[PDB]
Ligand binder design. Structure first.
Ligand SMILES: Cc1cc2nc3c(=O)[nH]c(=O)nc-3n(C[C@H](O)[C@H](O)[C@H](O)COP(=O)(O)OP(=O)(O)OC[C@H]3O[C@@H](n4cnc5c(N)ncnc54)[C@H](O)[C@@H]3O)c2cc1C
Lengths: 133, 665
């Protein structure tokens, strides 16, 4: 019902190696050429990616900033409010980035902050005008 | 075991009745199952008695004595069973001291063309049925294709050599009646490449297992894909193997293509990662500058200038985070390419060294079938493996000629008598033969019936070596053209000293080329004396016949030298090279199931010919021309046992015709 295991005998393949006298060596030569074509295309992208590797040698070690570890504080200094209004105008609703900018407020605090100072800081307008970017 | 082993050892099913028995006993088969089992017993029990001592005739009286009740109640049932068995050579066949000596006066006259084993087997049976039999033999000896070389102590069969197992083999019976020195055969066959050095066990098991694998593949190809016709021509075995190999070479290449295709897929995936990482590093390098400039505006500053430092700092750690997640991902792809480039699939299907070793297993198969694999029928070439005997294979150390010579005893044989024409008519037959030594002494033999055991090679000969008058009908001559008559030859090498491994019976030599795989590809150490036999198979056989003995023995010496060392190989004292296709009384070696033929042809060959009426409108005549030989038995062609069985078969049929069958009632 099935060929011995390892042997590959599909009704499709047989009638393709029997279509003519040389239809066998024809089929087997396209594959040989096809394998050679893939091998070169392999070494082509192997050298393309060897060049790209060289371009980013050194990674980004020189451009990293040390880590500021700060304790999420509760009170909004007048300074920290002002950082917020500008963070909103540059980031909109990305609270995680906005906290990252302030450095001592949590996303929850930032989330609350829009609701609390929404009228006093025209946060609707700010967002509204951030949307034009 | 017991009575049921008697049925097995007689190629009979112990619990069922055969088509032949249904013919002779239609009363019993159409009747109640109890009587069937009684019959089936009486058959098996009589067979057992004959088998337990086949050096003495088994008379009906002796038979009825030995079987008990309820089975010895129906004396005619017992008499019928015995007579059926005796007639068709299932009992009292071969060389048996008989109790009841021959009828003083005989009945009917039979001419048997050929004193090869099929011939002798019939002749002994007919003579033991009270008929007058004469065998016409072209050669100066009996045995036909059972030939045996003898000179001094040196003994080696140029013809048949091997009993293929005693399980269910009639030659087992003959082996008790004739002392044949039956030696077992150790099948360990170590190979040796052209260089002269053993193939290592790793390859030997590998290549062999691929060989057997390639065979089952053709079977699958024939049975499940019905790949048996191609360009309005029957597919051979050779064609089918080429297809299977090509498709295994194709799959190796398909496999490689997909493996490399997986690699370039990830390399392209990598490519787009680096592009994304160069372009990100460039942005990071810019932002850092922007930040360090904004950070260098010394304080105290206003809150926008402070926002600039902070935001640029966020923006930079944000891109620095991306670039780290991309570097982690880059390492993942980087190791994959190491994994794949380190797990490549098979480079090739079979190397040239491997293919040459495979070519030897093919030569061995070409040798067993005595023909190039391009001539064997794909569908039917193995149609007789179902009836293979059980047990080890054996040689005859004292020479296999001992058996026909034994059968020829007490028979009227005309040696050096070549039949030239066979004439059969509604009133009898005349066979016309000449003397081989002087071709003008002409002989005329008149007879009731002719048994033709002419080799299929001879019946195939164009122009005819034997004319049939009237000609054979085309249903028979077309069977003769369709069937295959193949060829294989032996070189007998006779030394004064044993320089080979005495515990290896047989060892191979791997050929240079596909085309020459059969040239001396195997060697036999089967005999007491220092004899090594080299064999020629496949396409090589027909070509080695146009090369002198000295050149042929030359090549054997060279091959042997490479194996055992240029100094351990003496010259041979006695050399003999067979040339069986050249032999005019054989014109080949034995039959094969050619592409376009089938096992039905072997039955066609066995049909007797019945001449037309001489007087027009006179009643339909009796058959006059009968045939036997290895090419006439569908389940056991190309063997000695098969020839012998066919001789027994005709002797029963001829006797039924002329002596009459009284056991059918
Ligand atoms: C090399 C070789 C090895 C073999 N090895 C084995 C083996 O190991 N085991 C095995 O079982 N089988 C083997 N066989 C096959 C076996 O030998 C044959 O199947 C069997 O011997 C044939 O017997 P036969 O009676 O059919 O024909 P033959 O033995 O050929 O009898 C034919 C007879 O007809 C004669 N004859 C031919 N033309 C004429 C004519 N015009 N007039 C008169 N007489 C004529 C011949 O001379 C011969 O006497 C082998 C065959 C060969 C060739």
């Amino acid at each position: 019902r099935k060929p011995p295991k390892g042997m590959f005998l599909s009704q499709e393949d047989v009638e393709a190696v029997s279509a003519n006298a040389t239809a066998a060596t024809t089929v087997l030569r396209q594959l040989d050429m096809e394998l050679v074509s893939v091998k070169r295309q392999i070494q082509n992208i192997k050298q393309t990616n060897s060049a790209l590797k060289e371009k980013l040698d050194g990674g980004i070690e020189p451009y990293r900033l040390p880590e500021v570890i700060q304790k999420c504080n509760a009170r909004w200094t007048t300074e920290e409010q002002l950082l917020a209004v500008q963070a909103i105008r540059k980031y909109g609703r990305d609270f995680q980035a906005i906290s990252d900018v302030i450095g001592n407020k949590s996303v929850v605090q930032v989330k609350n902050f829009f609701v609390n100072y929404r009228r006093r800081f025209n946060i609707d307008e700010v967002l509204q005008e951030w949307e034009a970017e | 075991s017991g009575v049921e082993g008697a049925a097995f050892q007689s190629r009979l099913p112990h619990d069922r009745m055969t088509s032949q028995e249904a013919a002779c006993f239609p009363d019993i088969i159409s009747g109640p199952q109890q009587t069937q089992k009684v019959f089936l017993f009486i058959r098996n029990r009589t067979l057992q008695l004959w088998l337990d001592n086949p050096k003495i005739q088994l008379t009906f009286e002796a038979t009825l004595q030995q079987l008990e009740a309820p089975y010895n109640s129906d004396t005619v049932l017992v008499h019928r069973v015995h007579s059926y068995l005796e007639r068709h050579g299932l009992i009292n066949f071969g060389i048996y001291k008989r109790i009841k000596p021959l009828p003083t006066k005989k009945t009917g006259k039979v001419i048997i063309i050929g004193s090869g084993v099929s011939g002798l087997a019939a002749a002994r049976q007919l003579q033991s049925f009270g008929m007058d039999v004469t065998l016409l033999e072209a050669r100066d000896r009996v045995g036909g294709r059972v030939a045996t070389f003898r000179k001094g102590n040196y003994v080696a069969d140029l013809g048949a050599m091997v009993v293929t197992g005693l399980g269910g083999n009639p030659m087992a019976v003959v082996s008790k009646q004739v002392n044949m020195e039956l030696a077992k055969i150790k099948q360990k066959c170590p190979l040796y490449e052209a260089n002269g050095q053993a193939v290592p066990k790793e390859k030997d098991e590998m290549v062999e297992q691929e060989f057997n694998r390639l065979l089952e593949a053709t079977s699958y190809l024939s049975h499940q894909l019905d790949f048996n016709v191609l360009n309005n021509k029957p597919v051979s075995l050779g064609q089918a193997l080429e297809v299977v190999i090509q498709l295994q070479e194709k799959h190796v290449k398909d496999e490689q293509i997909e493996h490399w295709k997986k690699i370039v897929k990830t390399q392209e995936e990598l490519k787009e990662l680096l592009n994304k990482m160069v372009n990100l590093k460039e942005k990071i390098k810019e932002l850092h500058q922007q930040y360090k400039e904004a950070s260098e505006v010394k304080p105290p500053r206003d809150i926008t200038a402070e926002f600039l430092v902070k935001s640029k700092h966020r923006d930079l750690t944000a891109l620095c985070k991306e670039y780290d997640e991309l570097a982690e991902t880059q390492g993942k792809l980087e190791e994959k390419l190491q994994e794949l480039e380190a797990n490549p699939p098979s480079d090739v299907y079979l190397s040239s060294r491997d293919r040459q070793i495979l070519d030897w297993h093919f030569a061995n198969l070409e040798f067993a079938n005595a023909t190039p694999l391009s001539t064997l029928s794909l569908k039917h070439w193995d149609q007789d493996d179902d009836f293979e005997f059980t047990g080890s294979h054996l040689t005859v150390r004292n020479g296999y000629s001992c058996v026909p010579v034994a059968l020829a005893e007490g028979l009227d044989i005309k040696l050096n008598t070549a039949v030239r024409q066979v004439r059969y008519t509604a009133s009898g037959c005349e066979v016309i033969a000449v003397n081989t030594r002087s071709t003008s002494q002409t002989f005329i033999y008149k007879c009731d019936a002719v048994l033709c055991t002419l080799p299929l090679g001879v019946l195939k000969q164009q122009p005819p070596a034997v004319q049939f008058v009237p000609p054979l009908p085309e249903w028979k001559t077309s069977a003769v053209q369709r069937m295959g008559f193949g060829n294989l030859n032996k070189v007998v090498l006779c030394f004064d000293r044993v320089f080979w491994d005495p515990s290896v019976n047989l060892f191979g030599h791997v050929g240079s080329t596909t085309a020459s795989r059969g040239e001396l590809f195997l060697f036999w150490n089967l005999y007491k004396a220092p004899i090594l036999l080299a064999l020629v198979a496949g396409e090589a056989a027909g070509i080695m016949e146009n090369i002198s003995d000295d050149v042929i023995v030359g090549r054997c010496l060279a091959i042997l030298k490479g194996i055992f060392g240029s100094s351990a190989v003496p010259q041979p004292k006695e050399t003999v090279v067979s040339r069986w296709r050249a032999d005019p009384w054989a014109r080949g070696s034995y039959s094969y199931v050619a592409a376009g033929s089938s096992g039905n042809d072997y039955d066609l060959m066995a049909q007797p010919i019945t001449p037309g009426p001489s007087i027009p409108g006179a009643p339909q005549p009796i058959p006059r021309l009968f045939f036997a030989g290895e090419h006439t038995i569908r389940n056991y062609p190309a063997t000695v046992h098969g020839a012998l069985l066919s001789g027994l078969r005709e002797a029963g049929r001829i006797a039924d015709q002329f002596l009459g069958a009284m056991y059918t009632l």
